[PDB]
Design a protein around this ligand. Structure first.
Ligand SMILES: [Ca+2]
Ligand SMILES: [Ca+2]
Ligand SMILES: [Ca+2]
Ligand SMILES: [Ca+2]
Ligand SMILES: [Cl-]
Length: 348
């Protein structure tokens, strides 16, 4: 009954932030977390070169990894990219070789346990009709070359992919989900940010929407026992920040953790309500509104222990491998007290 707990270690360029996040994991560490994924990515180049967040010969990477290893966890450095820079790279077979080589020397000069690839949209999808042109096959070739290489080193490969809902979403055609699922050990479907920073307010990851995404992914024929679902630790506070050139109201928002949301609702005396996404949403997502001292109306959507628990149940419905939440930086001591036991109940 043991499921995979992949935690994202978003310390960015701050060595102390990495340490502070580990220290926020209580009891026996392996009872809550299997893998930790640090975003040690500084910049990825056209030619496939890789630049990390600190100086060249820094001992930070080795020290942080031995730290996590001492706690019984495994480390999978997050390699994330997007946009034009990543499109040129994958197009070039030399640049693909180059990046993989940089990954190889990283896992050697760190003794890490593998890598989480996070190549996000925008990605070249070419013509809309043709579902097979663009960077799609070049991306697959990268994953297959990486998988072949790292598995020789007895290292793990996890790939974070965009949450596709249906066939009409042509801009996601870069992800050959079936072929990709065979080039990884785990497939992390990032089922969150259904509502984002400048969109209309709403649940960041509604219960029926996650199931909807996973149903599509299942339809592509991927092995669901290799799929890690996604869940947000953060919420969002939306306001109307103005107008566009055509007079249309524009939204903007700030992201925060579970604790901040509670303090907010308490400060303004707003009552929290579970927003049911539709008739197929039993528990729902917590939400509230308030008006600040400047007269601006705010709308908040976030996740508590109640909604988190309902969404984690999807692991049992689809027989998933586990969950990859984003991210530990959104968890403070108050949140951690109830969140980690909650994780242990579902991930055992
Ligand atoms: Ca992301
Ligand atoms: Ca296309
Ligand atoms: Ca199509
Ligand atoms: Ca208008
Ligand atoms: Cl943001």
């Amino acid at each position: 009954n043991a499921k995979i707990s992949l935690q994202y270690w978003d310390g960015y360029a701050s060595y102390e932030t990495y340490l502070r996040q580990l220290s926020l994991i209580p009891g026996k560490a392996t009872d809550y977390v299997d893998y930790v994924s640090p975003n040690w990515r500084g910049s990825i180049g056209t030619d496939g070169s890789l630049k990390l967040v600190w100086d060249e010969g820094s001992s930070n990477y080795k020290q942080l990894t031995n730290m996590a290893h001492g706690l019984g966890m495994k480390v999978l450095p997050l390699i994330n990219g997007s946009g034009a820079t990543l499109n040129t790279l994958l197009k070039s077979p030399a640049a693909r070789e180059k990046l993989i080589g940089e990954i190889v020397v990283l896992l050697k000069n760190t003794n890490a346990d593998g890598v989480v690839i996070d190549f996000e949209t925008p990605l070249d999808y070419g013509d809309v009709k043709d579902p097979y042109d663009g960077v799609r096959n070049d991306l697959t070739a990268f994953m297959e070359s990486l998988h072949s290489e790292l598995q020789s080193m007895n290292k793990l490969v996890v790939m974070a992919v965009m949450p596709r809902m249906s066939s009409s979403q042509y801009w996601l055609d870069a992800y050959d989900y079936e072929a990709l699922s065979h080039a990884v050990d785990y497939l992390h479907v990032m089922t969150y940010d259904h509502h984002y920073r400048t969109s209309a307010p709403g649940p960041i990851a509604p219960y029926p929407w996650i199931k909807q995404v996973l149903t599509y992914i299942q339809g592509q024929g991927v092995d669901m026992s290799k799929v890690l679902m996604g869940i947000p630790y953060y919420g969002r506070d939306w306001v109307v920040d103005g107008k566009d050139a055509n007079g249309n109201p524009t939204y903007n928002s700030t992201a925060f953790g579970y604790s901040k949301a509670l303090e907010l609702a308490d400060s303004y005396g707003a009552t929290i309500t579970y927003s049911k996404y539709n008739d197929a949403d039993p528990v729902g997502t917590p939400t509230f509104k308030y008006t600040d001292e400047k007269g601006v109306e705010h709308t908040v959507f976030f996740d508590d222990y109640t909604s988190w628990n309902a969404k984690l149940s999807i692991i049992n419905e689809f027989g998933l491998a586990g969950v990859g939440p984003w991210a530990m930086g959104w968890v403070d001591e108050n949140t951690a007290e109830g969140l980690f036991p909650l994780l242990n109940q579902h991930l055992r």
